[PDB]
Write a protein that binds this DNA or RNA. Structure first.
Ligand SMILES: [Mg+2]
Ligand SMILES: [Mg+2]
Ligand SMILES: [Mg+2]
Ligand SMILES: [Mg+2]
Ligand SMILES: [Mg+2]
Ligand SMILES: [Mg+2]
Ligand SMILES: [Mg+2]
Ligand SMILES: [Mg+2]
Ligand SMILES: [Mg+2]
Ligand SMILES: [Mg+2]
Ligand SMILES: [Mg+2]
Ligand SMILES: [Mg+2]
Ligand SMILES: [Mg+2]
Ligand SMILES: [Mg+2]
Ligand SMILES: [Mg+2]
Ligand SMILES: [Mg+2]
Ligand SMILES: [Mg+2]
Ligand SMILES: [Mg+2]
Ligand SMILES: [Mg+2]
Ligand SMILES: [Mg+2]
Ligand SMILES: [Mg+2]
Ligand SMILES: [Mg+2]
Ligand SMILES: [Mg+2]
Ligand SMILES: [Mg+2]
Ligand SMILES: [Mg+2]
Ligand SMILES: [Mg+2]
Ligand SMILES: [Mg+2]
Ligand SMILES: [Mg+2]
Ligand SMILES: [Mg+2]
Ligand SMILES: [Mg+2]
Ligand SMILES: [Mg+2]
Ligand SMILES: [Mg+2]
Ligand SMILES: [Mg+2]
Ligand SMILES: [Mg+2]
Ligand SMILES: [Mg+2]
Ligand SMILES: [Mg+2]
Ligand SMILES: [Mg+2]
Ligand SMILES: [Mg+2]
Ligand SMILES: [Mg+2]
Ligand SMILES: [Mg+2]
Ligand SMILES: [Mg+2]
Ligand SMILES: [Mg+2]
Ligand SMILES: [Mg+2]
Ligand SMILES: [Mg+2]
Lengths: 116, 87, 101, 70
RNA sequence: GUGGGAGAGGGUGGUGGAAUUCCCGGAGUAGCGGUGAAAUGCGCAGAUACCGGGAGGAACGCCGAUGGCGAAGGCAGCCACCUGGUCCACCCGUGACGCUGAGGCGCGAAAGCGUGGGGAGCAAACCGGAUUAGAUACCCGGGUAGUCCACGCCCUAAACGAUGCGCGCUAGGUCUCUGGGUCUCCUGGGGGCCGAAGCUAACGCGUUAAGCGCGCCGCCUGGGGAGUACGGCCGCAAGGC
């Protein structure tokens, strides 16, 4: 229903949860997945395993659209963001490249008390 | 700022003999120039306090030289006062 | 009058008439603000490091000038008024500090 | 891997318009390199910073870049 | 005086990028968020994640230091202007013009007050959620004053080096910032660490004295009662001395 076959895979991973989004080369989404997308509910969504399964889900749903190769963009520091990488590699999607994009402020905003 | 020619013309003006740079007359004069400028810059920039401390200090220095000069040679004092427009 | 360097970055998509017009209006700016010109280095198209006004590139001019003190700020203002001038940076001149010498 | 200063000619540390040189004081990311890497001195480094920043304003140099691999 | 410096010292104006929030558009479903685990909360009126565009406020990553400047409070993107202090070299000028300083006057973090603005994030009070003997509390979701700007008050603090200012004298070693020099190094000014003599109840201090001395100012005189009461002065008030 699209026929992309090469594109971008964003892995957004926080300590609480890991979410994956697969998109077309100009950035528009195709599919997505996350800890909650598969079974898990609570803290269980932050485990490396959930990341694995979410990466894998996203890749299955991608290879339905016809996705072959993908450039990876990683954002955040969280349990098994590297597991989402490792999963997303052996998924069968050939990975073109990997980049760590984690956004960082030049010190704009006061953070929450738990962050100081 | 106070450029070199500006400053020189003042030293020329107030020097006792040629070549005199550091006499009491010239110190007071130079000081006075600095003070005036500073006061102009504190007429606006009313919130620049640190500069103002600087002013208090210069003002004080001047008063010291004046008190001295007046102590030693009252004539030169009245002269300097009249010329500068102080007190 | 002190020594300054005026850096002007403007939009790369200009043709002849346009470029010459912005440039001549800049000339007029400096003439009006009492800024004598010494050196002029026009480097033109360069690929910027980050997009400026959604443009991937920029067109560069570098003037060296001597102009009065209080007039610099206002000069910069009347430079930036131009819609096609993307960035202006006016910088007090400095002697060439070297290194590894 | 030795210092940046170590391999370079005599170069204006004050020239914000020269990218071919200043680029070498930035990491993979946009970041200005620590003294340990730059091989500069206190005063030197201190000048290089200002110079770089001026350049970045002019868009000749990155405020930040994106890390490859990792 | 002349000639050189280094610097987040101060004031004014302008400008730059990252990020957060919100608004607009696309693409895209079933959740996101959050915790020890959870729930409140937000999501089918399409959220979260992703791309483009806009608006706004606040704060300046790397550089950055065990660094620098300031009398102190304190000062950190970049640019210009206005301005304070200070270090060095030359040995040029004046000729004791010095030190200190009760009172006075000025400055003085944060919070707080008044009148206007501004308001993104944070967040006293407050409203909710789970913990769980119990919630006024530590954890979670919201959230007002406030935080920001102008002007005018307030005058406190672990305002700390818990060490008043100035001058002279008394081993060195080492790291460092910043000048000068004939730049194995020496010489001057800062910042640190070890240590001579000495000091100290001890801990420690030791050319950045807590050593040896002189000058001047401030202050102390067992605990509790009490920084309370009374009085006075200041303040719009809080409250301060
Ligand atoms: Mg979770
Ligand atoms: Mg494969
Ligand atoms: Mg909140
Ligand atoms: Mg001088
Ligand atoms: Mg400053
Ligand atoms: Mg400023
Ligand atoms: Mg949308
Ligand atoms: Mg639900
Ligand atoms: Mg609901
Ligand atoms: Mg945006
Ligand atoms: Mg708004
Ligand atoms: Mg740091
Ligand atoms: Mg320090
Ligand atoms: Mg302090
Ligand atoms: Mg100055
Ligand atoms: Mg002599
Ligand atoms: Mg004589
Ligand atoms: Mg008394
Ligand atoms: Mg007093
Ligand atoms: Mg106050
Ligand atoms: Mg306040
Ligand atoms: Mg109140
Ligand atoms: Mg108020
Ligand atoms: Mg108000
Ligand atoms: Mg409870
Ligand atoms: Mg809260
Ligand atoms: Mg302290
Ligand atoms: Mg004493
Ligand atoms: Mg030492
Ligand atoms: Mg030295
Ligand atoms: Mg040297
Ligand atoms: Mg020393
Ligand atoms: Mg010791
Ligand atoms: Mg002993
Ligand atoms: Mg003793
Ligand atoms: Mg002993
Ligand atoms: Mg001992
Ligand atoms: Mg002493
Ligand atoms: Mg003692
Ligand atoms: Mg008693
Ligand atoms: Mg009290
Ligand atoms: Mg009373
Ligand atoms: Mg009254
Ligand atoms: Mg009280």
């Amino acid at each position: 229903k699209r026929q992309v076959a090469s594109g971008r895979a964003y892995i957004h991973a926080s300590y609480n949860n890991t979410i994956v989004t697969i998109t077309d080369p100009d950035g528009n989404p195709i599919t997505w997945s996350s800890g909650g997308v598969i079974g898990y509910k609570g803290s269980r969504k932050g485990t490396p395993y959930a990341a694995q399964l979410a990466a894998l889900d996203a890749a299955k749903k991608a290879m339905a659209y016809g996705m072959q190769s993908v450039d990876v963009i990683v954002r955040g520091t969280g349990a098994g963001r590297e597991q989402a990488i490792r999963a997303l590699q052996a998924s069968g999607l050939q990975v073109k490249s990997i980049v760590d994009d984690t956004p960082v402020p030049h010190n704009g905003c006061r953070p929450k008390k738990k962050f100081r | 700022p106070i450029t070199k020619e500006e400053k020189q013309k003042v030293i020329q003006e107030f020097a006792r003999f040629p070549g005199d740079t550091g006499s009491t007359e010239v110190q007071v004069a130079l000081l006075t120039l600095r003070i005036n400028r500073l006061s102009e810059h504190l007429k606006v920039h009313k919130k620049d306090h640190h500069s103002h401390r600087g002013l208090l200090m210069m003002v004080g220095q001047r008063r010291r030289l004046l008190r001295y000069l007046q102590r030693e040679d009252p004539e030169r004092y009245r002269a300097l006062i009249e010329k500068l427009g102080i007190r | 009058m002190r020594r300054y360097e005026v850096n002007i970055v403007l939009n790369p998509n200009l043709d002849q008439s346009q470029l010459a017009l912005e440039k001549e209006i800049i000339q007029r700016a400096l003439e009006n603000y009492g800024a004598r010109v010494e050196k002029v280095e026009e480097l033109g198209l360069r690929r910027l490091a980050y997009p400026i006004a959604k443009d991937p590139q920029g067109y560069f001019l570098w003037y060296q000038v001597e102009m009065p003190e209080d007039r610099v700020n206002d000069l910069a203002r009347e430079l930036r008024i131009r819609d096609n001038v993307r960035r202006v940076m006016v910088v007090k001149s400095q002697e060439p500090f070297l290194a590894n010498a | 891997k030795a210092k940046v200063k170590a391999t370079l000619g005599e170069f204006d540390l004050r020239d914000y318009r020269n990218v071919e040189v200043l680029k070498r004081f930035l990491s993979e990311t946009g970041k200005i390199l620590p003294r340990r890497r730059t091989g500069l001195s206190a005063k030197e480094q201190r000048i290089l910073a200002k110079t770089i920043k001026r350049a970045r304003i002019l868009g000749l140099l990155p405020f930040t870049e994106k890390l490859v691999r990792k």
